[PDB]
């Protein structure tokens, strides 16, 4: 069901965590890293849906980065 | 280590699940960028909340709290 | 500075309040009704800015309702 | 009494302040609709919060709390 492999995702999450934390010892529950990935993928899916509304608004059928940037801008 | 591990087929399939069949080649780096920003914010908030609670293990409820913001 | 007249706005606010409350006795501080109007107008202004990004995305210079509806949809 | 009291010139001038010089005639009812929904939600939350606090007068801080949601 999840489209990103769990190991690449967890390496990216850990890297981002360590950059924020600068080395403070934290660890993640497996259920935590899963919650995060599930929400990340759902976020990307719904952003793709929103941005595709803009593709069609521009009279296109191919998603362009401007469609995704406009959706992000309008989101917040 | 590492944003490039979010692969091109993963990205196409996420776009597909969101009803998008055709994407510009430029979408790969666009999605990487959006994902990194999303995780930076959620992870920041989740860990901050774990710290406020004087705990060392980030839980699913910590992540859920972060998402709610 | 505020573009909507204060009396029409306050009549609309009170009407909406009473429909929610169904007659529970509440009243508004003048500073409350002002805060509300200031935020309402700022909300409309920023929605107009967001929706106009979509007008230009569609290759137009005239705001259409679809531009405003798309902006609302993408907002939440 | 009354959504029609949000006048056409008010609406044009709000659109103008947001950088929009030209609007469809259809925008008048569109703006009315959006405004009503916004106020219904904010007023609901502001009054709910005034009630939770056992008060009878809605204050600016009640409205500010409502907006933050």
UniProtKB/Swiss-Prot annotation, chains A, C:
Tell me, in one coarse class, where this protein mainly resides: nucleus
Q: What is the effect of changing residue 10 to E/Q?
A: Impairs interaction with HJURP, association with chromatin and localization at centromeres
Which positions carry the signal peptide feature in this UniProt record? none
Compartments annotated for it: namely: Nucleus; Chromosome, Centromere
| Impact reported for residue 54 to C | No effect on location at centromeres. Abolishes location at centromeres
Q: Which residues carry this modification: Phosphoserine?
A: 10
Q: Which UniProt keywords apply?
A: ADP-ribosylation, Cell cycle, Cell division, Centromere, Chromosome, DNA-binding, Host-virus interaction, Methylation, Mitosis, Nucleosome core, Nucleus, Phosphoprotein, Ubl conjugation
Has keyword Cell division?
A: yes
Its quaternary organisation is: Component of centromeric nucleosomes, where DNA is wrapped around a histone octamer core. The octamer contains two molecules each of H2A, H2B, CENPA and H4 assembled in one CENPA-H4 heterotetramer and two H2A-H2B heterodimers. CENPA modulates the DNA-binding characteristics of nucleosomes so that protruding DNA ends have higher flexibility than in nucleosomes containing conventional histone H3. Inhibits binding of histone H1 to nucleosomes, since histone H1 binds preferentially to rigid DNA linkers that protrude from nucleosomes. (Microbial infection) Interacts directly with herpes virus HHV-1 protein ICP0.
- What's the protein here called? Histone H3-like centromeric protein A
The range of the complete sequence contained here reads 60 to 134 of 140
UniProtKB/Swiss-Prot annotation, chains B, D:
> Glycyl lysine isopeptide (Lys-Gly) (interchain with G-Cter in SUMO2) cross-link position in this chain?
8, 36, 56, 68
**Assembly mode:** The nucleosome is a histone octamer containing two molecules each of H2A, H2B, H3 and H4 assembled in one H3-H4 heterotetramer and two H2A-H2B heterodimers. The octamer wraps approximately 147 bp of DNA. Found in a co-chaperone complex with DNJC9, MCM2 and histone H3.3-H4 dimers. Within the complex, interacts with DNJC9 (via C-terminus); the interaction is direct. Interacts with NASP; NASP is a histone chaperone that stabilizes and maintains a soluble pool of Histone H3-H4 dimers.
Residues where N6-propionyllysine is found: 8, 21, 54, 56, 68
Give all N6-acetyllysine modified positions: 8, 68
Gene name, per UniProt, is H4C1
Task: Identify the species of origin.
Answer: Homo sapiens
Q: Which disease is given in the protein's UniProt record?
A: Tessadori-Bicknell-Van Haaften neurodevelopmental syndrome 1: An autosomal dominant disorder with onset in infancy, characterized by poor overall growth, microcephaly, hypotonia, profound global developmental delay, impaired intellectual development, poor or absent speech, and characteristic dysmorphic facial features, including hypertelorism and abnormal nose. Other variable neurologic and systemic features may also occur. Tessadori-Bicknell-Van Haaften neurodevelopmental syndrome 2: An autosomal dominant disorder characterized by poor overall growth, microcephaly, hypotonia, profound global developmental delay, impaired intellectual development, absent speech, and characteristic dysmorphic facial features, including hypertelorism, abnormal nose, and wide mouth.
Q: What does the record give as the function of this protein?
A: Core component of nucleosome. Nucleosomes wrap and compact DNA into chromatin, limiting DNA accessibility to the cellular machineries which require DNA as a template. Histones thereby play a central role in transcription regulation, DNA repair, DNA replication and chromosomal stability. DNA accessibility is regulated via a complex set of post-translational modifications of histones, also called histone code, and nucleosome remodeling.
Classification lineage = Eukaryota, Metazoa, Chordata, Craniata, Vertebrata
Q: Which residues carry this modification: Phosphoserine?
A: 24
User: Glycyl lysine isopeptide (Lys-Gly) (interchain with G-Cter in UFM1): where is this cross-link?
Assistant: 8
Included stretch of the parent chain: 25 to 93 of 103
Name listed for the protein in its UniProt record:
Histone H4
The post-translation modification note in this UniProt entry reads:
Acetylated as part of spermatogenesis progression prior to histone-to-protamine exchange.
């Amino acid at each position: 069901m999840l489209l990103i492999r769990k190991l690449p995702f967890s390496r990216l999450a850990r890297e981002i965590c360590v950059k924020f934390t600068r080395g403070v010892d934290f660890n993640w529950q497996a259920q935590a890293l899963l919650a995060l990935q599930e929400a990340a993928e759902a976020f990307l899916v719904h952003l793709f849906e929103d941005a595709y509304l803009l593709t069609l608004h521009a009279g296109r059928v191919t998603l362009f980065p401007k469609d995704v940037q406009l959706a992000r801008r309008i989101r917040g | 280590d590492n944003i490039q591990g979010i692969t091109k087929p993963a990205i196409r399939r996420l776009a597909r699940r969101g009803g998008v069949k055709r994407i510009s080649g430029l979408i790969y780096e666009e999605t990487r960028g959006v994902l990194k920003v999303f995780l930076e914010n959620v992870i920041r908030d989740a860990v901050t909340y774990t710290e406020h609670a004087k705990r060392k293990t980030v839980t699913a409820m910590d992540v859920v709290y972060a998402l709610k913001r």
